[PDB]
Amino acid sequence: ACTKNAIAQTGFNKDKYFNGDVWYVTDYLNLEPDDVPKRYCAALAAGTASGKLKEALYHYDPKTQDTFYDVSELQVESLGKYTANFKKVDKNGNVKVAVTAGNYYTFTVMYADDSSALIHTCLHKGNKDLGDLYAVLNRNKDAAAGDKVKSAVSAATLEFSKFISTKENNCAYDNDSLKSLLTK
Ligand code: HEM
């Protein structure tokens, strides 16, 4: 179950965040800790494609090799707060699991600048959810979390020390697929 109404960044700059480029997850915190593995790789692209607000997601479990991509049309709830559908696709955008009622995530940008961000998501997939999930993002897949984003974690009344890093998993991404998936 999700429990947090995440507050979007004051003065969030949507066009900068949704610029078509890739964001890498460097650290994450699930409030239901057993909802997700302790080793994981994730990234997304975010942009407007032919007037439509889009995200493309990538998930990879570096131990099991479980891999999946998704394409998401985002609807606006308020500035920096979205409800995303999702269809599971291969890396080329071919549909594996169509959009359906009941499969959606919320997505809140709590903090962002040109290089870093803090987001919250609540996944609903069936009558189930994947509890509250916070993620620290960077444009540079190898970047240690800096002071702007760590301060934002504190301002959310969270402890960065509890976040799990993705950096020791040999994560390798297909940026080209993420960018192209925005159009799909
Ligand atoms: C970057 C922000 C993220 C978003 C928006 C997001 C969104 C999603 C979505 C939409 C799905 C379902 C995909 C499908 O069935 O087609 C999913 C599944 C999953 N995500 Fe994330 N995710 C994010 C990051 C993460 C991170 C950092 C982890 C940490 C391990 C994670 C763990 C999982 C797991 C384990 C599943 C499979 C759930 C299941 O079907 O049992 N995700 N995520």
| CA 115 – CA 129 distance, rounded (Å) | 29
Pick the CATH number of 1-184 from 2.60.40.2310, 2.40.128.20, 3.10.129.10, 3.30.1330.90: 2.40.128.20
Sign of CA dihedral 124, 85, 180, 6: negative
| CA 104 – CA 74 distance, rounded (Å) | 10
Nearest-10 Cα torsion for 84, 166, 174, 102: -20
| CA 134 – CA 39 distance, rounded (Å) | 15
- Measured in Å, residue 129 CA sits from the centre of ligand 1 at 10
Q: Radius of gyration (Cα) for the chain, nearest Å?
A: 15
- Measured in Å, residue 59 CA sits from the centre of ligand 1 at 7
Resolution (A): 1.0
- Cα 34 to Cα 5, 63, 81, 91, 133, distances in angstroms: 21, 16, 26, 28, 12
By what technique were these coordinates determined?
X-ray
Feature table: binding site for heme: 59
Cα 114 to the chain's mean position, in Å?
16
Q: Where are the domains of the chain?
A: 1-184
- Measured in Å, residue 23 CA sits from the centre of ligand 1 at 15
Ligand 1 atom nearest to 30, measured from its CA: 29
Ligand 1 atom nearest to 44, measured from its CA: 1
| CA 41 – CA 10 distance, rounded (Å) | 29
At 134, which amino acid appears?
Y
DSSP 157: T
